[PDB]
Q: What sequence folds into this?
């Protein structure tokens, strides 16, 4: 509930490569590390509990289904395979509770989101994180990732990114735990990595953009994609993500540090901001925002025999849902019927999860966090219908349950 | 550009099964068909070119990545496997042009979207379609699917669904072809299919809701999820999608038909609305709206050697981007390096597409519509770096290209 500041950093794989090839000592590469060091030192000294982390995936985990604002709500995130194998990094921990509260505020502010778990983070996240935070056994803080769909047009306007940041500030502020939160925006600065224009940089624009983002970010809010691509290269226009982070900070900030280095394709830059707090009181008190965020499901606990699939439940039931979900794969559901024990022995399921499936504990699974639709599919796999599951939920024989219906009929989701 | 009207219909897999099992002869099932018949007949008579089709995926194609408003932008859609094989239905065609236009308008109105291609349509979609539209040989119209994330809370508010429908109206009207568009809302009415409350129905509310949706929909815009689930059962609350459809229609509509039937778990209902056009001209002209929708990328054409990855290019490049994307899978990439021709032979790629990859035609791939990040993965897989691809983009040797950089370094996205 206290924002301590935030940082902006390039995410080019140059950075990841430098860490992985130990170019630390090499003077050609060294300005990257000198650039990142104060940010690294600040994070080690301030110890945020959670860093809300703004980046874009580069058509690695996000491709056939591609969303604008994708909130990472899961327990952990491993590195993604980008065609040369996963980087040797430990998973970083998420924060489902914080993520949930943020989702709730942002949805009440009429932003449309995506939620995701269990997919890798590509270079867009782990390239700079790997230089900013020591990563033995785990990582110094939690992150709540926000993956932004900045590469498939149309994308949200610069001002939408800004306005997201503003709502994010209040959401974070109003989270009812006394914890420290830093905000990161990655990407940029100028670069183009495609077409005959590949190799474009604009240091003059980079300096001005840095200056304006720090001290007059509202001046940037009428910039178009075209404006940003013309001045800083096609992919350099990813800096709208810097506007999101900056919008989540105080109207004025202390620039603790900034760095600029252009060795190759990309202007590698960092910026470190100390939040200055709110000069003005907020239009809406934390108390009132918290009540407005929960008003959609206020009173929902009064509904008996109902297990709302909220984010916490989605996270709790993730492994088992994910396993049951694979029953739509013909080779997987074949192994499930024929050699279930072989499939369990290979899974990441707890004994309790295996046992619920093995016992066909219909209500037990709903209770646990399984969404009915996973049970619907399992039913189909076993050649039994929906009515069988419903009767099990009611603790009744199929015949007794069928008496509650206006007609006695049967059906399933089975195809051909 | 002309909206002819819209229809609301239940999407329970009772309907899909009723059709696949030929239950039209059984009087217990008969009235499912009796209810759908007028909507069937209206469709055959009116012949819309495209149905803009609002449904929810029941955690089949959307699970680990789950978005609020996911717009189907691809060429065609096949039925999904839901554990019992795909239903025996021919693919239905998309409308990438209409979908791109709608994206542009909705984003300008500050709705945050997801874009998807190539994933199957579950019972949310094909269940009622299979009874609404003959499919002996393909389908009578195209669709643009809007998959709504109504199952994992927090979801967007009732008023947000409605407002989406309000912009969608203008989005469709402003589309510059004289096609006829129908709009479909699916789901409902009262049902609950999980927990000890499974089997809840409330006919008295279903009737009020039908009444109010037809003739006073704005009186529904204050309903919370709690209101909807309490009155209509947990899953019954998906009727927010009916609201979205209704928002896209004229403020007043003529109800041509409604039906209601409660055999088993779900209240199976249909509503058919005739659009009445616009009483007064819109707040914003079609032309001003298109201006607003296009301004972010206006004058992007003046940026040389640059190929914005817009939706049309995402559709054009889908097959090949998909194929290259699979380079992230260890087994796939090993086949790619070791027997590319075997891999090509198995794939759905065209000869041109195969050539582009075979010849390592970097810039030719960009021109074709391959996004660079697929090429980045491909270079990594092949043991070469980003520099190599950038040099080819420019038509320079690597040493000649390195001279344009401040330092001559090499790097890639390779892991362990
Ligand atoms: O070649 C580069 O410097 C580069 C490559 C990337 O994939 C990227 O996202 C980036 O920001 C920079
Ligand atoms: O059992 C039912 O009537 C039912 C099952 C579903 O999976 C569903 O999406 C629905 O709207 C109704
Ligand atoms: Fe490391
Ligand atoms: Fe990026
Ligand atoms: Fe059929
Ligand atoms: Fe449903």
A:
């Amino acid at each position: 509930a206290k924002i301590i500041g935030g940082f902006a950093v390039s995410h080019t794989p140059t950075i990841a490569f430098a860490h992985d090839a130990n170019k630390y000592d090499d003077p050609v590469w060294a300005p990257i590390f000198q650039g990142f060091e104060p940010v690294k030192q600040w994070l080690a000294e301030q110890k945020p509990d959670v860093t809300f982390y703004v980046y874009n995936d580069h058509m690695t985990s996000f491709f056939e289904h591609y969303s604008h604002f994708a909130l990472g709500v899961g327990e952990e995130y491993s590195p993604a395979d980008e065609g040369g194998g996963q980087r040797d990094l430990p998973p970083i921990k998420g924060d489902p509770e914080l993520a949930k509260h943020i989702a709730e505020c942002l949805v009440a502010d009429e932003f449309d989101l995506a939620y995701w778990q269990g997919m890798g983070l590509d270079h867009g996240a782990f390239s700079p994180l790997s230089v900013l935070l020591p990563h033995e056994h785990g990582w110094p803080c939690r992150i709540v990732p926000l993956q932004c769909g900045v590469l498939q047009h149309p994308i949200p306007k610069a001002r939408r990114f800004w306005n997201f940041g503003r709502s994010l500030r209040r959401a974070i502020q109003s989270y009812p735990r006394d914890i420290k939160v830093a905000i990161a925006g990655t990407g940029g600065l100028s670069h183009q990595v495609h077409g005959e224009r590949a190799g474009f940089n604009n240091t003059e624009w980079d300096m001005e953009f840095m200056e304006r983002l720090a001290n007059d970010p509202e001046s940037l809010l009428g910039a178009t994609v075209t404006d940003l691509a013309k001045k800083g290269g096609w992919e350099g226009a990813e800096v709208v993500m810097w506007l999101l982070m900056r919008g989540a900070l105080s109207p004025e900030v202390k620039t603790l540090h900034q760095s600029y280095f252009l060795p190759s394709m990309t202007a590698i830059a960092t910026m470190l901001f100390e939040d200055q707090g709110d000069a003005a009181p907020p239009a809406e008190s934390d108390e009132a925002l918290r009540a407005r965020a929960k008003r959609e499901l206020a009173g929902v606990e009064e509904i008996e025999g109902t297990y709302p699939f909220t984010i916490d439940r989605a996270v709790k039931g993730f492994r088992i849902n994910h396993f049951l979900h694979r029953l739509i794969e013909p080779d997987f559901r074949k192994r499930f019927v024929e050699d279930p024990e072989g499939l369990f022995a290979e899974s990441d399921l707890t004994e309790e999860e295996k046992s619920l499936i093995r016992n066909r504990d219909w209500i037990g699974m709903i209770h646990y966090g399984v969404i009915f639709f996973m049970l619907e599919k399992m039913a189909a796999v076993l050649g039994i219908g929906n009515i069988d599951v419903y009767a099990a939920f009611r603790g009744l024989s199929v015949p007794e349950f069928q008496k509650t219906r206006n007609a006695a009929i049967t059906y399933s989701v089975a195809g051909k």
Observations:
- The CA atoms of residues 103 and 407 of chain B lie 42 Å apart.
- The pocket of fe (ii) ion (ligand 3) is lined by residues A 19, 130, 135 (CB under 6 Å).
- Residues 305-411 of chain B form a domain with the Protocatechuate 4,5-dioxygenase; Chain A fold (CATH 1.10.700.10).
